[PDB]
Ligand binder design. Structure first.
Ligand SMILES: C[C@@]12Cc3[nH]nc(C(=O)Nc4cnn([C@H](c5ccccc5)[C@H]5CCCCS5(=O)=O)c4)c3C[C@@H]1C2(F)F
Length: 249
């Protein structure tokens, strides 16, 4: 779990700040890693180490891997899998107009596969969104921010924004919104709406509009994730088969 600091070389700052202070680095060389600096006393060493170990166990090619934790010296950090092509939100936005619908659907399949793994381990993400996903080798998309997380109403299911009632089904609502962000090529959901207007509109039955590149079938899957009650929303396991099936149909 714990990396001796002598084994790391920090190079340059990378990223636009959606994950804070990140460097490109090398680990016991010349393996590229992303190193993320964190605050000194948010956890206590034991909890922190035990949660780095739990995170490292959650090992799936659609999840950005934690390699370990460097805490011998300050500033302390997280050592992560390096993701060649940065944050999905920027990847999508800078390259608007250059994706086939099929390519956008494959991106939602990548996330859904990571999420179906978390779902199966009884792990709730709680902040799933395009900004928390990263793009790798051969443009694979991977999910991050599912551990070491120590209000985004736009991604929150109604029972999360009303009473913080989190579940894998509230992650499914968030994944609907991520699907909209992907198919709209990184547009901001409910962009000119305040938090309480989002809340009031969602309560009334309002839903994000259909992006031009999303087919009718895809948008119907979107609207299933945004079912008002969690019991009506499909589970990731079923969404994974479904999206792959629509890809094939
Ligand atoms: C949860 C983590 C893990 C993590 N892994 N990789 C990153 C990360 O920021 N990757 C990144 C950022 N920039 N780049 C590219 C890069 C940068 C430097 C050399 C080579 C390629 C950029 C190349 C220039 C065009 C834009 S780009 O494609 O974004 C990769 C993260 C962040 C997040 C964390 F560490 F906490």
């Amino acid at each position: 779990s714990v990396i001796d600091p002598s084994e790391l070389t920090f190079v340059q700052e990378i990223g636009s700040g959606q994950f804070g202070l990140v460097h490109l680095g090398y680990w016991l060389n010349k393996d590229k890693v992303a190193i993320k600096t964190i605050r000194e006393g948010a956890m206590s060493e034991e909890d922190f180490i035990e949660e780095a170990e739990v995170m490292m166990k959650l090992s799936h090619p659609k999840l950005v891997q934690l390699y370990g934790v460097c805490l011998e010296q300050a500033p302390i950090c997280l050592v992560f899998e390096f993701m060649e092509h940065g944050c999905l939100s920027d990847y999508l936005r800078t390259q608007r107009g250059l994706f086939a619908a099929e390519t956008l659907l494959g991106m939602c399949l990548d996330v859904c596969e990571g999420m179906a793994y978390l779902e199966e381990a009884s792990v709730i993400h709680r902040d799933l969104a395009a900004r928390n996903c990263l793009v790798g080798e051969n443009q694979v998309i991977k999910v991050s921010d599912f551990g070491m997380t120590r209000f985004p109403v736009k991604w929150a299911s109604p029972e999360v924004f009303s009473f913080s009632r989190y579940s894998s089904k509230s992650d499914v609502w968030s994944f609907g919104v991520l699907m909209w962000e992907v198919f709209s090529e990184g547009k901001i959901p409910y962009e000119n709406r305040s938090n309480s207007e989002v809340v009031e509109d969602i309560s009334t039955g309002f839903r994000l509009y259909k992006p031009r590149l999303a087919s009718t079938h895809v948008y119907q899957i979107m609207n299933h994730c945004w079912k008002e009650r969690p019991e009506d929303r499909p589970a990731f396991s079923r969404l994974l088969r479904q999206l792959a099936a629509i890809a094939a149909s």
